[PDB]
Amino acid sequence: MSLLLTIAKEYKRLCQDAKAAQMMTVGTVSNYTTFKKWTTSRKEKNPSLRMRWAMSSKFPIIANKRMLEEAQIPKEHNNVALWEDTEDVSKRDHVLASASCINYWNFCGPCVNNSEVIKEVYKSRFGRLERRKEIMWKELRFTLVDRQRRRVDTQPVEQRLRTGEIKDLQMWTLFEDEAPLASKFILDNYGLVKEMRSKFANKPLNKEVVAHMLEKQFNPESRFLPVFGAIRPERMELIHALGGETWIQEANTAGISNVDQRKNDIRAVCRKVCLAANASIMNAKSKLVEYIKSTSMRIGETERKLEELILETDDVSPEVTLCKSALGGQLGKTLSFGPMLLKKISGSGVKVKDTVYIQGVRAVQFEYWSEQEEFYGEYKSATALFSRKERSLEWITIGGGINEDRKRLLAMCMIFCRDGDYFKDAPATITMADLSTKLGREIPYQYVMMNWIQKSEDNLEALLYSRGIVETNPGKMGSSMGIDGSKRAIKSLRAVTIQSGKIDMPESKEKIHLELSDNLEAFDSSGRIVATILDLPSDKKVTFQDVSFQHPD
Amino acid sequence: MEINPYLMFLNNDVTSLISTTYPYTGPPPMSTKYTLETIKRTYDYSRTSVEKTSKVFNIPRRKFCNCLEDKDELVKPTGNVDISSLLGLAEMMEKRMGEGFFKHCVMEAETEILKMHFSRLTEGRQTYDWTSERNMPAATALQLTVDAIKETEGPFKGTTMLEYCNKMIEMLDWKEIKFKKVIDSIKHDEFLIRALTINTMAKDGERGKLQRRAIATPGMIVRPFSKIVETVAQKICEKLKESGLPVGGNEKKAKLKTTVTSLNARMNSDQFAVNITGDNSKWNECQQPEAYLALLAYITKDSSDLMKDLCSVAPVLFCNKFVKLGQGIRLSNKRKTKEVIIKAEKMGKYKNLMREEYKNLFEPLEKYIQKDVCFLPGGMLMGMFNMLSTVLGVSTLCYMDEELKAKGCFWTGLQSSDDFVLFAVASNWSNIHWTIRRFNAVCKLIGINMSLEKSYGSLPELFEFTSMFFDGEFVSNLAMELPAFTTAGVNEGVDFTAAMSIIKTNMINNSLSPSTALMALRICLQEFRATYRVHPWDSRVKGGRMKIINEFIKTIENKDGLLIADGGKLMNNISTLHIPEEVLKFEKMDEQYRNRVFNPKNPFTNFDKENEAVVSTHSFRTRANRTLLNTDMRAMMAEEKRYQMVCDMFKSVFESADINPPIGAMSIGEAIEEKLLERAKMKRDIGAIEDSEYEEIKDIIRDAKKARLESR
Amino acid sequence: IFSFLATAADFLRKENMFNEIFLPDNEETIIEMKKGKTFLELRDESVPLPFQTYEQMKDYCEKFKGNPRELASKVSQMQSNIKLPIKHYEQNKFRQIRLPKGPMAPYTHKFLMEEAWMFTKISDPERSRAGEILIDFFKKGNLSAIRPKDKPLQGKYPIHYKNLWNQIKAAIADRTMVINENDHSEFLGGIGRASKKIPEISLTQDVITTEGLKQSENKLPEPRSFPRWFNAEWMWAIKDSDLTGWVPMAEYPPADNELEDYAEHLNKTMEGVLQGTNCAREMGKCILTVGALMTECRLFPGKIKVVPIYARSKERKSMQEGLPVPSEMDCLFGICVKSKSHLNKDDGMYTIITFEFSIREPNLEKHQKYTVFEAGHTTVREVPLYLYCRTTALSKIKNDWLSKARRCFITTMDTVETICLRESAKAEENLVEKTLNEKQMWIGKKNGELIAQPLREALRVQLVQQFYFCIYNDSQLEGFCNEQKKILMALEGDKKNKSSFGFNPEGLLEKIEECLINNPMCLFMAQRLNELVIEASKRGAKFFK
Amino acid sequence: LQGKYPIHYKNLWNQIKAAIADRTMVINENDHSEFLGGIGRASKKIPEISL
Amino acid sequence: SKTFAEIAEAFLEPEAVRIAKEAVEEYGDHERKIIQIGIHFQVCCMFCDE
RNA sequence: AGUAGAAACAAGGGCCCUGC
């Protein structure tokens, strides 16, 4: 209306100038961003000092003038000043005012029709509040705590997205006339956009604020923190009030925010399609990609495509890895050898060939790495820091909490390093039938020994015996490990050390582009395998809810 | 009785109480003599006298790299470097990490330098303008340099970093440069010297090491190349494990802990370790840019031919720098009634009326001096290259030799800039001593010294690293971060939530105990009430705000819902530190009050943008200073006002200019015109507009277009 | 095709890669740094010594191959002409620290602590500002009974102080806390004693020879000796004061879990212990008086004002017997005066002047700067009265930091709670009350024996230490506290049989003793550190006597 | 519309539908039912002899 | 980010990326040209359209 | 006078303005 005409007159006056015309004529529109920096640049060293020294003045705040006249905010209400006609030096369209004026507004100022929209603008923080109210505290106890440091997520978030997928979402919900061409994320996630749009439409709002809040609503805040107990976004958001180094505020927080259930559902589906595609013999690659893109799943209220969730998750499991690999999704540098988890700290090497005799004389090639390397390793509730040297387990330290877990972690490390004589002369129990090729697909001797261990506990006992056993020297009595997994004994295994206190998971904000073979085994610019299909569970039956495998097979 | 607090250190550990020593509860304490002494020490440490003469400036050039002489008292610092040894150390580091390492890193860096926009030079600490010859913020300095480019030859069409760098290179070969002023021009030689200049700033915000009492501020013709070098240096440093400069907090603690476990597991039964806490000295006065030039040449050897040329600039520019003497000496009579003031360019004139100390310190540096600047051809300054120095330093901790292994000796450790920790291992004290001496020797061959007073050692688990004392446990001093528990200084809306967040992170990382956190919460609340001159309603305080507070308080029915800035009480505690109060009270405010507060049309609210807070009427902005009102800085305010007019109009038409950065092929005038016509139609079709109004708007716009295109 | 290209163009423009660099034509496919003429001239000039052109250096670096043997040879050679000393402390022990020599370091804090006397009244909520309390105390007549005489016990410029006191009373009587600029106030406030400028363009040799204009000779401070009045202050600031609530504090929020109950309980006990001491009343005095001066400096610059030195407290709580609901109190220790605090820029200085009331005669060594007068009599019976007077200064920074003097509580609470939780965790039980009532802490020596007392009573020593750090902080104290950690780390290594060593310990002691000059806190703590190592030498090595 | 522990009831309803779909009426996870049944009373117990 | 290949993978099919990558390796040109080629290649492909 | 530290303050701009 009249405002539109005013804007037109303003543009004309501005074009009448000479420099303004040149700057509005040259280059593209992107220059706006640049111009936004050359203006209004001024900082301060110690804002605390200047706040106590600025609020001590008479009129320390600025404020609009027309908004005050329109609101009929007087001056000198009850012998206390509220503002005075002047012009701040920077704005030139604002007038000095005092802090009391703010209170005046809050008590006898103009009221908007409704403000419950606030609960939607700030959904994340009202969500914190709601989850908190449903916690049932318990006694407080004192003791030392084993806090391991690691990277975790502190924000429970549904439908975690990327950044490019938000900068557009912030447009179709708030500034739709100025929206760009429709991107794939929009056309696919239509219901989501409709949902965010229904709430912030035909409402009195400041939109810059709403847009920033949407960025916050879709961000899993990832932090490197000391941590204890279960790992769930609901706990990590209030970890400060659950325990420190010397105390624990017991409380049950198990039934809230339902995050990990979605993740376990996703991994179950991924395992399903990976096994299915494995059923093939010549197209497991294309079969797998087809099964992936031909599937969908429900998340809360919305319907999402599988391939879209897989490229958003961060589950470092041997199943999610394969899928993210087929779809060309980059990923982190985390290894996986069966159930354990691994991560390299330093060292190097390169493949080398060797052979072993299964029964009598039957040469079988198996590879190893010719150099020294250092690794962090993680099994259920047990951690380890070990080193391999040219087909040998040089040393290892453990910081777990159970005897069973300690024994299994040590055993899988020995296998991972080809340490022992078994890799030199396999046991009689194994045969060429157990060797490999369920239906033709070979099996490296590593996973052979792996399943041989998982078969019977006595195989595990024998493998540990493959490690040297000696008499516990004096003093080292506490840092020694028997065959049962006892923190001390008279005779313990060789070159092994125990300790109370988990090991700090290493960290690296790196990404790598890997690939895979026709046997579904991923490689990383080297002969190392980061994932495979032999390291995941054999099989199980499950009833998936809210899933769509709209594909014949 | 006689009192002695230190007696508590007998029956107790020392780390679990070491924070008590830090006097951080009081104000910390706040020229040319200092700069002259620095220039002198730099020229001395170069233990040589060879010199050449620069055909460009015609000034003697002390060359300090590979020219060691005067090999006496090496215990004292030395700033000469043997490039051969430097490259040997770099090669060993590469060998450890594997081949194709440096190449990969320069590739990752080049992937960013190219797409970067040249406006990211606005972000950063102050810089030294080369037109007014004073310290402006980075934004204003960049604006003025661009304006000079445009007024000299033609507007700067560039839009990326490489184009800005090429323009700078060209400007080193022009013959007459123009720029605005209360429109002076200058020649080539004067501008060249005025570009290589470097200034100093006495900020040194952090207490930390009291030795830091200044910091460097290069110009704007040197900023982009420094950014390039630092980007590659960061990409290198992040990969190494023996470095702790980029990482922060829990990361470096975890690094140290894994290192200690690895050490204790490796060493055999006939070996024992030792630790050392080191603090190199004169760090920024021994680092030479010539060695950096040689090392960056060795790194960028297999990469593209573009990075080979970019990385080599910042070294040569720092190899030819001029320094700025500040404020000169002051003359006076006996009674001190009168007082004359003198500047740097004149001290060469009244060199007879100065103390014998200044004469002994100044006349030697009289040939290197030019008008109020000195030609320091080497050395370094504070803050210039931190990550690159850490790389150069970490290259040593990786050393290994045949002699060290013939005796079964090896060292490791962890270094951040000029602060390290060493872990030596051997089988006997005669060999621990020998290993330590070997490390010190390899460090001296490349200018890395060691402070013999500030450095100490001991048996394994007792050391310190960047104010973090380590033993079986980790003592979070918790006094290192005490000053932060104060009102940030933004506005009322923000400060309380910001303070609560700081307390929360401390409880998580630095192990602040519960009751202490409650105490800090109450203290911060009292300080907040004191700063903003407000107090509860139930209290009896009188004053400006409390007057209207008590006046209208009767209209309320539930004070539990008021905000602190309105005479409200505290409803927050340990278990609710992660929740802003506006959220914790929303369900109890009065609809009247609630609606008057969270109203978007407020003459006060401003957005700041991390900013985990709620926005409301209390989110105000302070007045702007007015000292400039008297200063004749107004001509510069003019151009700023012009840019502001353009931007605020563009935003008036397009509301998402700030949220979503604009893009497209139109200019600004084209986009504005087109959008206005479109909106005019959109309304006139259905909305409240008449054909007369539509035609008037269209006529106005076509005339505006004609004027815009006609001016030039 | 057109649709695909549109999407691609948007993506690229968003990534700033829609440029000739990434999307060149056939020709513009060679991007390169525009090596000019001057820059090349420099690069071939900045080369290390053996080379003379960047091309040679580049070829030497691009082809460099590793020769470990020559490297080892140079390393060993450098290892021989160095001779780094290594000194195990047990063999090379630490001498004692040498404090400077001269007169004693006098009182330095702006306000009096031990000799301060106060007039008290009951506080009414209506009259609560400072400029008002200063008048209420004036009506009852005691403030007007004071009348010093022209003969001071010690000091200088007694006439100026006397006239200024008379003007102060007059100004209070007129209900306008302002003072006029006369010769007296002008002399005590240093109004016009700022140097006068003389440009050099108007300068000549004759001018210099007329009035000598040599370069100003900075006169660094001169040394002092160990203060013998500091221990008295430390023991006086440890006892209760007959009142409480000296330092204002906020309220306790609600609580929902046992953790917060624990937090509230411990916080209440400790605050109740500390709020009753004398160190607390000194903190409250500083808080309120500096708050008042800061406001005045902001509103009324260029005007000499009158500000009181006061505090607010609450009389202790007896049993329910007698008069319940103990009352509040406004206390007045003296008068203060500012002088044109035109703090145009931080770190500036605005002189102030302090007239305080006391009942204890002075000492030449301690009260050196003051100018004492015999005022008259006051009750308790009758007892004499004195009036300590001086001049000093402050700045924005000292104002801001003194007003925020409640940090001492945070640090002290931190230390105590840490000890208690550490002892409680090792046993997995609440040993907090036990650890506060039983665990004993050494405090000092008396009659050559050590003294100890429960943690609950040892808190006061730590609190006073933190308050003094807040008061006497300077660069000297900064450097000292920075250099003593090396000694404590040596001590701990000694306690745990870790065979410490160092490279040059004498240099460390020299660095420490360099920063000991005329600062009571530094000198006091240095003497106490010497005594610590002495007392421990009876139980550990690495320290010489 | 009016309630006390909406999150627990909602998650428990989801678990009920899941159980019914699987043809087994049992509910494995014991977090919501446990809470909502224990809200009345649940605590530790100290032997009288250790007092 | 962190490499032109990763950038190009944002709006191209990973297959065309691998093709243009092998091509630039064949000619040994600056790998900032992974982008143009992938774009060009994909146009040609979608021009065939089966 | 006094302050402070290894240099600065003890108003500064045009009778009026102000306090990063």
Side-chain angles (χ1 to χ4, degrees), chain A residues 11 22 28 32 103 128 178, chain B residues 566 612 656 658 664 673 712:
Chain A
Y11 175 80
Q22 183 194 0
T28 182
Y32 169 88
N103 305 96
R128 294 177 176 180
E178 310 174 13
Chain B
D566 297 329
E612 175 174 4
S656 63
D658 294 359
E673 300 157 16
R712 303 183 179 177

Side-chain angles (χ1 to χ4, degrees), chain A residues 177, chain B residues 675 677-687 694:
Chain A
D177 57 330
Chain B
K675 196 69 173 180
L677 305 198
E678 180 176 357
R679 311 232 188 185
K681 290 189 293 186
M682 179 180 301
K683 281 187 172 183
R684 182 232 60 189
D685 273 299
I686 189 181
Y694 182 96

Side-chain angles (χ1 to χ4, degrees), chain C residues 375-398:
Chain C
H377 295 61
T378 191
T379 64
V380 170
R381 71 187 183 282
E382 283 289 356
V383 182
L385 196 70
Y386 310 96
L387 199 72
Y388 288 78
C389 315
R390 63 175 289 195
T391 298
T392 169
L394 286 177
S395 63
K396 287 182 172 177
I397 310 182
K398 284 177 165 50

